[PDB]
RNA sequence: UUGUGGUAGACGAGCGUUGUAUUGGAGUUGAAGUCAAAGCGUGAGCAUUGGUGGAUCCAAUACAAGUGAGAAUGCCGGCA
RNA sequence: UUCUCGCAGUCAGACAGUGGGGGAUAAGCUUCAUUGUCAAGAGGGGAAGAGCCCAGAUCAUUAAAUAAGGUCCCCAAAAUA
RNA sequence: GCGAAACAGUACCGUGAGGGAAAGGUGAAAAGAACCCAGAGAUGGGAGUGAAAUAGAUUCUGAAACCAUAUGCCUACAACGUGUCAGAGCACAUUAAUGUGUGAUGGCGUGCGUUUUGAAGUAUGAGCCGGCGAGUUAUGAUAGCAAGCGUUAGUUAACCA
């Protein structure tokens, strides 16, 4: 701002008697040093605020829409195994099944580790442990695997 | 010859095969219209209008005029309104007249 | 057929130049070197030698015939300036602008060489319309 | 004294009509060729035929 | 829109006229003659072409002004020196110089234009009635 | 975030320059003086638009006055004659067009006369 | 049908800019920027073609702002 | 034009007609009550005028009838008695 | 953006404390332009390398003010806030349009912001161009609009993962 450019506190011109401007300060906002007026500062909080209850109604009806549009394939623990570490097995799945250029996203419940061994190299798609989908993280999916379990815990969720 | 012909709101001397621009007349290219109003139209003279007369033209198209852009500006008193205007006009000419 | 020449930051003024070059432009070529010689300008010695330096090159180059010679179009176009604090009465420090000025010459071989410049001209214009016209086959 | 408003860019280049040069006169020495401004002696030294000085 | 109004432009042909300004007097003949000179009596008085006829006023000393003017009304001159005001009175204009007087009591009559200067040379004024303006063969008529 | 933004300043002001060409002397370069005598001259367009059928129907009435003062009556007279006798609606232009064609203005003249 | 002048001033609807997000897509067969042209809009503003230039960019919906300059005897640079 | 709620702005006014004070039935003076206008309002008349008279501009038309004022020329428009 | 993208707290001002700047980009790579002509020489014009030398060491792009050249039109009796509405003649030919550039001649016409009862103003600000530059932010209050949740309702803060 004004202040914290190093700067001159002292005045450039005397106030009268000399005919150029007033101009207090070498460092003003109007003149090329530059004192910012008023600028962006570090502190902006940046944060809103949603309501728990908003918040459970929101998921639901994400949930609703996005479980009912031809594409939520249910899936088992069994081909999370029977998966190498090798991500050719799960590019092989994805285009068996159809789903290349979307991007689809894997719910897990238990974060079966030869799963997201594969898929982190590929940059569509992204495997979440069911506490950690959100509302944009999910009507982003476009298509999306959940597995038989959850549903349990879905439940219960509302 | 000539004729004198009210279309629109305007008077139009006019002879046969001259093109005159008149104000719209909701009428597609091509067809037919025959103005109604009529004064003068051949050492005949119809006081109010000459009855049972028209002169019959073909529509020859539709265009907008020139652009007149029209701003007023109240001095030093912060006043800048602007506006723009495309006045609409049929262009057409005439084939033969009634008698 | 143009053949010019040109000298760049000369130090002489952009207005004192145009003062023989309005002299020696538009005449012939052999009552020009002559005619800018027996001037007597500062402007003078600095334009014979460029004149010098075009008609050569005009002769060696492009093989033009000499003689048919004439100097198309002179001017002294604003070289880059130098800027200089000058004293004064009681420290008030002027600035003093030296100037200077880039010196061109042409010397056209056929006596018309100006219509071809509006050809040009005209072929810039003809080929805008025409491949706006080119365009409008968007249906 | 000072201007109150500036000179435009017409009214100065009027002023300047009378400022162009003249084309010096100009004669051809005799004795050689060369185009001496009339009245004076060329660098040829020779004036008319007369000779007033050195080579050049 | 409509159809344009028809305006003559350089399709200007004038001819010459005469009067005999005898027993007129001035005013009343200066407005004719403003009138004839303007061409504001022709059928297509295009505003802006000098449309007007040529006019040609004879035996200008002989016009006559009514009432008591000889004597009491004055016509100014103003150089741009100082105590340059010539004065001049009705009687001494109806003798000393007369063709001046009507040019004079004409051109006022002209609108501050550009044609104005251009209008009031075509008023040929002779103050007696021989004059050298019979090679044009000027028409006649009477108190114009 | 920083926005600079000298694209936009620039179109605008050549807008207002490109309107005021044919302009004398700078009034076609600096722009503060462009927009000036932009606006003034769309002031000048407003006004005219009205005064110019203001004085078209004057110089009608003089184009016509001048016909009927050759043929014994003043146009003052031949309003009358319209209106009151033998009513027509014929336009105040046109009547006065007629005399550039004329040898059917005078049945019009005469017309009245009844 | 009744209206539509208007400073201070209240209210409404909007254009443009920079970037982020997802969605489409154009680009060395020449991108933005820059000039020129005899276009289209009710306005802020928006296209089309060509020369130059030599790699990024346009539209749709939201979002966030160092967001919109003719004036401050304004600041800096250039030029009269 | 009454009531409630949000949001202001304003508190240097001027002139013409009318009725009076101060003033000297002086001021384009000053201070009031009233009717308008200007401010914040263009066009026409007024030769030219912020405040007078007529009027109250959405934009285009090279259409017609009018208000104040006005009709020898400038300047559009008239004659008779 | 740090005052500072580079040899910046330098150069520079001041006796001294102290004050205190500006400016970067060839091309992919020097293949930095041997040689020839003019010239005293810088340099320039050809050549040559290279995709391009309108990339040439003035080195990415290269507006405007500004200064010069030129086709086309007008202007040397003319009172001019410099334009507009009409309008001739002239010369061309387009983002195909009742077209474009100039514009003899008629009518008409006392700039922009500011502040003022009121300014063309003999009141003030701006020489011109370009860029920079002025109602934001944190935390709370009330009001309007929208949404979630609801009649023993609603709602989290700090903190932890
Ligand atoms: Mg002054
Ligand atoms: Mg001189
Ligand atoms: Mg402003
Ligand atoms: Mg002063
Ligand atoms: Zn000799």
Same mark, same amino acid.
């Given at each position: 701002?004004?202040?914290?450019?190093?700067?001159?506190?002292?005045?450039?011109?005397?106030?009268?008697?000399?005919?150029?401007?007033?101009?207090?300060?070498?460092?003003?906002?109007?003149?090329?040093?530059?004192?910012?007026?008023?600028?962006?500062?570090?502190?902006?909080?940046?944060?809103?605020? +949603?309501?728990?209850?908003?918040?459970?109604?929101?998921?639901?009806?994400?949930?609703?829409?996005? +479980?009912?549009?031809?594409?939520?394939?249910?899936?088992?623990?069994?081909?999370?195994?029977?998966?190498?570490?090798?991500?050719?097995?799960?590019?092989?799945?994805?285009?068996?099944?159809?789903?290349?250029?979307?991007?689809?996203?894997?719910?897990?419940?238990?974060?079966?580790?030869? +799963?997201?061994?594969?898929?982190?190299?590929?940059?569509?798609?992204?495997?979440?442990?069911?506490?950690?989908?959100?509302?944009?993280?999910?009507?982003?999916?476009?298509?999306?695997?959940?597995?038989?379990?959850? +549903?349990?815990?879905?439940?219960?969720?509302? | 010859?000539?004729?004198?012909?009210?279309?629109?709101?305007?008077?139009?001397?006019?002879?046969?095969?001259?093109?005159?621009?008149?104000?719209?007349?909701?009428?597609?290219?091509?067809?037919?219209?025959?103005?109604?109003?009529?004064?003068?139209?051949?050492?005949?003279?119809?006081?109010?209008?000459?009855?049972?007369?028209?002169?019959?033209?073909?529509?020859?198209?539709?265009?907008?005029?020139?652009?007149?852009?029209?701003?007023?500006?109240?001095?030093?008193?912060?006043?800048?309104?602007?506006?723009?205007?495309?006045?609409?006009?049929?262009?057409?000419?005439?084939?033969?007249?009634?008698? | 057929?143009?053949?010019?020449?040109?000298?760049?930051?000369?130090?002489?003024?952009?207005?004192?130049?145009?003062?023989?070059?309005?002299?020696?432009?538009?005449? $012939?070529?052999?009552?020009?070197?002559?005619?800018?010689?027996?001037?007597?300008?500062?402007?003078?010695?600095?334009?014979?030698?460029?004149?010098?330096?075009?008609?050569?090159?005009?002769?060696?180059?492009?093989?033009?015939?000499?003689?048919?010679?004439?100097?198309?179009?002179?001017?002294?176009?604003?070289?880059?300036?130098?800027?200089?604090?000058?004293?004064?009465?009681?420290?008030?420090?002027?600035?003093?602008?030296?100037?200077?000025?880039?010196?061109?010459?042409?010397?056209?071989?056929?006596?018309?060489?100006?219509?071809?410049?509006?050809?040009?001209?005209?072929?810039?214009? $003809?080929?805008?319309?025409?491949?706006?016209?080119?365009?409008?086959?968007?249906? | 004294?000072?201007?109150?408003?500036?000179?435009?860019?017409?009214?100065?280049?009027?002023?300047?009509?009378?400022?162009?040069?003249?084309?010096?006169?100009?004669?051809?020495?005799?004795?050689?060729?060369?185009?001496?401004?009339?009245?004076?002696?060329?660098?040829?030294?020779?004036?008319?035929?007369?000779?007033?000085?050195?080579?050049? | 829109?409509?159809?344009?109004?028809?305006?003559?432009?350089?399709?200007?042909?004038?001819?010459?006229?005469?009067?005999?300004?005898?027993?007129?007097?001035?005013?009343?003949?200066?407005?004719?003659?403003?009138?004839?000179?303007?061409?504001?009596?022709?059928?297509?008085?295009?505003?802006?072409?000098?449309?007007?006829?040529?006019?040609?006023?004879?035996?200008?000393?002989?016009?006559?002004?009514?009432?008591?003017?000889?004597?009491?009304?004055?016509?100014?001159?103003?150089?741009?020196?100082?105590?340059?005001?010539?004065?001049?009175?009705?009687?001494?204009?109806?003798?000393?110089?007369?063709?001046?007087?009507?040019?004079?009591?004409?051109?006022?009559?002209?609108?501050?234009?550009?044609?104005?200067?251009?209008?009031?040379?075509?008023?040929?004024?002779?103050?007696?009635?021989?004059?050298?303006?019979?090679?044009?063969?000027?028409?006649?008529?009477?108190?114009? | 975030?920083?926005?600079?933004?000298?694209?936009?300043?620039?179109?605008?002001?050549?807008?207002?320059?490109?309107?005021?060409?044919?302009?004398?002397?700078?009034?076609?370069?600096?722009?503060?003086?462009?927009?000036?005598?932009?606006?003034?001259?769309?002031?000048?367009?407003?006004?005219?638009?009205?005064?110019?059928?203001?004085?078209?129907?004057?110089?009608?009435?003089?184009?016509?006055?001048?016909?009927?003062?050759?043929?014994?009556?003043?146009?003052?007279?031949?309003?009358?004659?319209?209106?009151?006798?033998?009513?027509?609606?014929?336009?105040?232009?046109?009547?006065?067009?007629?005399?550039?064609?004329?040898?059917?203005?005078?049945?019009?003249?005469?017309?009245?006369?009844?």
């Amino acid at each position: 701002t004004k202040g914290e450019v190093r700067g001159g506190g002292k005045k450039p011109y005397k106030q009268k008697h000399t005919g150029k401007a007033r101009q207090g300060s070498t460092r003003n906002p109007h003149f090329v040093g530059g004192g910012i007026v008023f600028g962006p500062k570090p502190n902006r909080n940046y944060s809103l605020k +949603l309501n728990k209850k908003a918040h459970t109604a929101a998921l639901h009806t994400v949930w609703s829409e996005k +479980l009912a549009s031809d594409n939520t394939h249910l899936v088992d623990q069994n081909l999370f195994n029977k998966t190498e570490g090798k991500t050719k097995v799960m590019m092989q799945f994805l285009k068996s099944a159809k789903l290349l250029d979307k991007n689809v996203l894997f719910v897990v419940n238990t974060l079966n580790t030869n +799963l997201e061994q594969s898929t982190s190299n590929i940059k569509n798609v992204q495997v979440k442990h069911l506490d950690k989908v959100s509302v944009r993280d999910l009507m982003l999916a476009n298509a999306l695997l959940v597995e038989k379990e959850v +549903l349990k815990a879905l439940e219960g969720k509302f | 010859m000539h004729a004198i012909v009210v279309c629109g709101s305007k008077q139009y001397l006019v002879h046969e095969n001259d093109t005159f621009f008149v104000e719209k007349l909701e009428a597609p290219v091509g067809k037919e219209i025959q103005l109604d109003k009529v004064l003068m139209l051949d050492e005949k003279i119809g006081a109010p209008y000459l009855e049972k007369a028209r002169v019959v033209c073909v529509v020859e198209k539709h265009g907008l005029q020139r652009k007149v852009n029209v701003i007023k500006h109240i001095s030093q008193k912060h006043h800048l309104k602007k506006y723009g205007h495309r006045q609409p006009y049929t262009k057409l000419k005439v084939v033969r007249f009634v008698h | 057929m143009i053949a010019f020449a040109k000298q760049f930051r000369v130090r002489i003024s952009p207005q004192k130049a145009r003062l023989v070059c309005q002299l020696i432009v538009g005449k $012939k070529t052999a009552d020009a070197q002559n005619i800018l010689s027996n001037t007597p300008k500062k402007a003078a010695t600095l334009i014979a030698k460029l004149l010098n330096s075009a008609i050569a090159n005009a002769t060696n180059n492009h093989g033009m015939n000499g003689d048919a010679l004439y100097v198309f179009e002179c001017v002294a176009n604003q070289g880059p300036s130098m800027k200089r604090t000058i004293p004064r009465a009681k420290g008030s420090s002027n600035m003093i602008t030296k100037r200077s000025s880039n010196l061109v010459v042409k010397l056209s071989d056929n006596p018309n060489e100006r219509q071809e410049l509006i050809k040009q001209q005209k072929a810039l214009v $003809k080929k805008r319309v025409e491949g706006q016209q080119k365009a409008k086959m968007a249906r | 004294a000072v201007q109150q408003r500036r000179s435009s860019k017409h009214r100065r280049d009027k002023r300047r009509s009378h400022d162009a040069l003249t084309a010096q006169a100009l004669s051809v020495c005799q004795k050689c060729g060369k185009k001496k401004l009339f009245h004076r002696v060329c660098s040829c030294g020779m004036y008319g035929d007369l000779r007033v000085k050195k080579a050049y | 829109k409509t159809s344009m109004l028809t305006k003559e432009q350089a399709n200007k042909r004038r001819q010459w006229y005469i009067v005999d300004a005898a027993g007129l007097v001035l005013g009343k003949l200066a407005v004719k003659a403003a009138d004839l000179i303007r061409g504001k009596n022709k059928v297509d008085f295009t505003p802006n072409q000098d449309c007007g006829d040529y006019l040609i006023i004879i035996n200008s000393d002989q016009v006559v002004l009514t009432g008591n003017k000889k004597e009491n009304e004055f016509w100014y001159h103003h150089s741009q020196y100082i105590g340059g005001i010539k004065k001049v009175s009705g009687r001494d204009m109806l003798k000393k110089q007369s063709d001046k007087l009507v040019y004079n009591a004409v051109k006022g009559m002209l609108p501050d234009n550009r044609l104005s200067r251009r209008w009031i040379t075509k008023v040929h004024v002779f103050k007696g009635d021989k004059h050298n303006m019979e090679a044009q063969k000027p028409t006649t008529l009477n108190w114009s | 975030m920083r926005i600079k933004g000298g694209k936009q300043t620039r179109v605008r002001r050549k807008k207002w320059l490109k309107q005021a060409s044919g302009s004398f002397g700078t009034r076609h370069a600096s722009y503060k003086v462009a927009k000036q005598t932009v606006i003034q001259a769309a002031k000048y367009a407003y006004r005219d638009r009205r005064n110019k059928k203001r004085d078209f129907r004057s110089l009608w009435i003089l184009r016509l006055n001048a016909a009927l003062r050759e043929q014994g009556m003043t146009y003052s007279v031949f309003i009358n004659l319209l209106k009151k006798h033998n009513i027509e609606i014929n336009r105040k232009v046109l009547s006065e067009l007629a005399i550039k064609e004329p040898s059917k203005f005078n049945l019009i003249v005469q017309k009245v006369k009844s």
